[PDB]
Design a protein around this ligand. Structure first.
Ligand SMILES: NC(=O)c1cccnc1
Ligand SMILES: NC(=O)c1cccnc1
Lengths: 484, 482
C-alpha cells in the first residue's frame, strides 16, 4: 500500500519553519477563529468537527502510519520526500526520529463543546505543544487541521440556518416542530468535491436534520461520534425515483405511477419525480386519477418536481393563467386530497400525499417558500426541502473567516505575544472564552498566570492531551446542545 | 474500531431503490459524464483529469479490499444493517449484493478520453455501462461516487491550465521561451481545501500544469495513482519559506533577522521571506537595499513575498501614489537596486539573486493584469511567481463546468432505447476528430457505435476489474502542454 507520511500532511514551508524560530523557542500556542461572516444574518457558527479530525488523524493516522511502524521507515519516507522536492542532499530528520521515539504526540488541544453557538471573532479551539523540544509540532499541524475542520463547521452552520427558518414557520403555522427534522434533506453528495468532504459536510447537516441521502455521513457519525443506527435515528430516507428511471419506464405515466405506488411500494413513503415530460399533466391527469389508490395506501406518496422556479412551482405563479400553474403544487394537491386545519388556521395536506423540492434550493428560497405558503394559508410543513451542493460545497474557509493563528510563544522562559500588523493592510497571548451574561466573549492578552486565573470561566475544555482523548461527545449530546 | 464504509453504500440513498423501479427485462444502462456549460470567462474547454485515480482507488482498490476479499456474509450483513435501520425496512433484500460478491469483480465497462486532453463544452469525456444484463443496476449505483470524485480534479486541472495559458503567452512574448513557467504557478491552497482528499485531487490537477506546489499530498498522489517517482522526475517542487508567525517570533529588527536567514540559515539556494509583517515598503527600502551585497554573494535566490494590499499595485506599482517606491512597485524597485538582464524580446528580467512571489488574493484576472502591466513597463512576466490559493481551487461547484452524469442509453428485453428528459445526449455517444475540433456524435445504436469505434477518442479504460489504460503523469503533462 502507498503511505502518505503523517509528517508531510502540510504546506511545504511548515517543514522549513522549525530552523527559523528563535533559539530557545519552547512553546507555540495557536487558536482557531472564525474571524468574519460572509452569509447574511449569520453572526455565529455551529462548532463541529474537531473530534472527528482528532480521532481520524491525530490518533488513528499517526498511530497506524507513524508510531507503530519502524523508526527507519518513517525517517526514510520523510527524507526521501524532502531530498527530492526541496533539493536537500541530506535532510535533517532527527526531530522526526525523536518524535517517533517519544511514541505519542506531545500536544494539548482545547475546544468549546461541539454544538455550541460561537460568535464571530471568538476562538473555538487552541493547540499547543506540551514538551518544549517539540514546539515545531504545533505549527506543523496547522495546515492539516485547518484543511479538515472548516467544512464540517461551515455545513453545520448553513444547515442550522435552514432549521431556524423551518422551526419558526413551523411554530408559526402548526404550533409544533415535529416535522422539521425531516424537512431539510441533504441531496448534495454528488456535488461535493470528494468523498471525505461528503462525509464532513453531511455530518454537519445531520446535527440539525435527520433526513439525508448521504449514507457516508450517517456512517461517519457512527465512526467518530458514537452513534448507532440500531439504537437511535441518525439519518433516514425513503425510496425515490430519478429521471432516468421514469424515462426508462415510458410515457404511459398512469400505469408507471400506479405500479410504483400499488405494487413496488404498496406501503410506506415513496418519492416520484414527476417532471420528466409534463409535470402539470402528471398532476392533473395522473395524480388526480390515482387519488383513490393514493388514499388507500398505508403510507405517503411524495411528488417531486425538479424544474422551473421552485417558489412558483410550490406556491403558485400569480401571473400564470392556467389554474394549476397559478395555484401551485401545494394548493392543487390540497384541492385533490384535502387534509386538516391547524389551530392557527393553516392547511396541512392529507398525510397520504406530500411534496419535496430538491433542485435550486437556497436559504433565501426556503424562507420565501415558507412565507408565500403562509400568505395563502398553507403550513410550512407541507414541503420537504432538498438541500444541494450549492449550499454545502460552494463555500470557502473564508465564508466564516476561519484562520488558525499562533498567538502565544515561550522563548527561553520569556512569555511573548505574536501578531502581524501590515502597513499595506487581532488576538494576542493566551485566550479564553467566558460567558458574560447572554453571550460568549473573548479575553486575550493573557499570560499563563492570568490564563490559569480564568480557568474556571473558560468554556474551552481539554479535548486531547499527549495522545489521550479526554472528551468524547456523542451525536445525541451535540444535537441536544444545538437544539436544546 | 476499523470502521468499514460498505463499498455498496457509497451513493445517494435512492440509488439503492432504483433497481426495482426499472422495467422488467432491463439489460443495459449506459451513462455519460459531460461538462455541459462553462461559468468561467474565456474557458470553453476542460482538461480531462481524474478518471485513473478514481478507478484505481475505488473501483479496484476499495472494492477488492473492502468488498470482494471479505466474507460474503459480512458484506451482506453490513448492507442489510444500514438499509434496515435507515430505510425502515424489516427485511431488506441483498441477493443482488450476494450475486455481485459471488461474481468476484465489477461487471462494468468505462471508456474515457486520454487525461490531459482538451474537451469542449457539451462534449462527453467518459462513459460507463454494465457488461452483464443481471447487473444493469450497477451503472446507476456508481453514478454518485464517481461524480463525487472526478469533477474537482478536472476543474482544478482546468483552472490551473488557464493560469498556465496566460503565463505561457506572456513568457513567449517577453522572454521567447517557457522555461520559467513551470514554477510560476505555485499551489498555496491546501489549508483552504475542504478535506485532505479534495486537497490531493485539486493539487494533482494543479501539478498537471505546474511543478511548483506547497501541497505535498498532491505530489504523493501522483506517485500513488499516476506512476510518478520523485526520485527520477520533478513532480512537484518548493523552496524554504517563512511565515508571519515566525517573522513576529524573530522580532522587529528585520535587518538582523533577514541577514541571519539569508547568510546563516539558508546561505545558499532559494529562500522565500514574507516581508509585510510590520511595514513591507520599509523592509524593501532599508532591509533589502542594505542587504544587496549579501544577497548578490549568495549562490541562490532570495524571494520577497508581500502578503497585503492590492496585488496589482504592489507588484506593478500604484500610479497615484506619491512615495516613489509605492508608485514604482516591487518589480521596478528591485530592478533599480539589483539590475538584471534583457531578454531576446527586449524585456527586463531581475538579477537571478532576487525574486518576487505573491500568494494572496491572486486570481486568473489578476495574474493576467499583473503580466499585462509589467509588460507595459518593459518587465518580463517571469519576474513574478504566482501563489494560487483556495479561492481558485476550492470556491467551485460541479456546476462551475456544468458536470453531469446522465443515463443516455438502455436495453430492455433486447430493445435498444434512448433515455432523455424534456421537462441533450441520446443513445450511445462517441467523440470524433472533426477537422480541427472534437465533435460529439450521439443517437447511435450499438451497430453504428461499433462501426465508429475506431474513430472514437473515448478509449477502453476499465472492464470487469481489468485496468486497460495506465497513463503516467509525464505522459499527461506531455499531452496537455504539447
Ligand atoms: N432522493 C432524491 O430524490 C435525490 C437525492 C439526491 C439528489 N437528487 C435527488
Ligand atoms: N510557501 C508559502 O509561502 C505558503 C504556502 C502555502 C500557503 N501560504 C503560504
Amino acid at each position: 500500500k502507498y503511505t502518505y507520511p503523517a509528517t508531510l500532511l502540510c504546506d511545504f514551508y511548515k517543514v522549513s519553519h522549525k530552523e527559523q524560530y528563535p533559539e530557545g523557542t519552547e512553546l507555540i500556542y495557536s487558536t482557531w477563529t472564525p474571524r468574519t461572516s460572509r452569509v447574511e444574518d449569520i453572526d455565529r457558527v455551529v462548532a463541529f468537527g474537531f473530534q472527528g479530525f482528532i480521532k481520524k488523524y491525530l490518533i488513528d493516522y499517526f498511530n497506524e502510519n507513524f508510531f507503530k511502524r519502524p523508526k527507519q521507515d518513517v525517517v526514510n519516507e520523510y527524507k526521501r520526500v524532502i531530498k527530492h522536492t526541496l533539493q536537500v542532499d541530506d535532510p535533517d530528520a532527527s526531530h522526526i526520529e525523536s518524535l517517533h521515539e517519544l511514541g505519542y504526540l506531545p500536544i494539548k488541544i482545547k475546544a468549546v463543546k461541539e454544538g455550541t453557538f460561537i460568535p464571530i471573532k471568538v476562538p473555538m479551539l487552541t493547540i499547543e505543544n506540551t514538551i518544549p523540544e517539540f514546539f515545531w509540532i504545533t505549527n506543523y499541524l496547522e495546515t492539516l487541521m485547518s484543511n479538515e475542520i472548516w467544512q464540517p463547521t461551515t455545513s453545520a452552520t448553513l444547515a442550522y440556518e435552514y432549521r431556524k427558518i423551518l422551526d419558526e414557520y413551523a411554530m408559526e403555522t402548526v404550533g409544533n416542530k415535529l416535522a422539521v427534522d425531516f424537512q431539510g434533506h441533504d441531496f448534495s453528495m454528488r456535488g461535493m468535491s470528494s468523498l471525505e468532504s461528503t462525509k464532513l459536510s453531511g455530518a454537519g447537516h445531520l446535527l440539525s436534520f435527520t433526513g439525508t441521502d448521504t449514507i457516508p455521513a450517517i456512517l461517519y457519525h457512527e465512526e467518530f461520534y458514537n452513534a448507532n443506527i440500531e439504537n437511535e435515528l441518525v439519518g433516514s430516507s425513503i425510496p425515490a425515483t430519478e429521471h432516468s428511471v421514469m424515462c426508462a419506464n415510458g410515457q404511459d405515466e398512469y400505469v408507471v405511477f400506479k405500479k410504483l405506488i400499488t405494487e413496488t411500494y404498496p406501503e410506506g413513503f415513496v418519492s416520484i419525480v414527476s417532471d420528466t415530460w409534463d409535470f402539470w399533466n402528471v398532476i392533473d391527469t395522473v395524480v388526480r386519477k390515482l387519488k383513490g389508490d393514493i388514499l388507500k395506501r398505508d403510507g405517503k406518496v411524495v411528488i417531486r418536481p425538479d424544474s422551473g422556479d421552485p417558489v412558483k412551482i410550490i406556491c403558485g405563479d400569480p401571473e400564470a393563467k392556467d389554474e394549476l400553474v397559478r395555484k401551485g403544487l401545494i394548493e392543487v394537491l390540497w384541492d385533490i386530497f384535502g387534509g386538516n386545519v391547524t389551530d392557527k388556521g393553516y392547511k396541512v395536506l392529507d398525510p397520504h400525499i406530500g411534496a419535496i423540492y430538491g433542485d435550486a434550493i437556497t436559504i433565501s428560497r426556503c424562507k420565501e417558500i415558507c412565507k408565500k405558503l403562509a400568505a395563502k394559508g398553507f403550513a410550512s410543513v407541507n414541503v420537504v426541502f432538498g438541500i444541494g451542493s450549492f449550499t454545502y460545497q460552494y463555500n470557502t474557509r473564508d465564508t466564516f473567516g476561519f484562520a488558525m493563528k499562533a498567538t502565544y510563544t515561550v522563548v527561553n522562559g520569556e512569555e511573548r505575544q505574536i501578531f502581524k500588523n501590515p502597513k499595506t493592510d487581532s488576538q494576542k497571548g493566551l485566550v479564553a472564552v467566558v460567558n458574560n451574561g447572554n453571550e460568549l466573549s473573548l479575553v486575550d492578552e493573557l499570560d499563563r498566570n492570568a490564563y490559569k486565573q480564568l480557568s474556571n470561566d473558560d468554556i474551552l475544555e481539554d479535548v486531547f492531551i499527549n495522545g489521550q482523548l479526554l472528551r468524547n461527545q456523542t451525536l445525541s449530546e451535540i444535537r441536544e446542545l444545538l437544539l436544546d
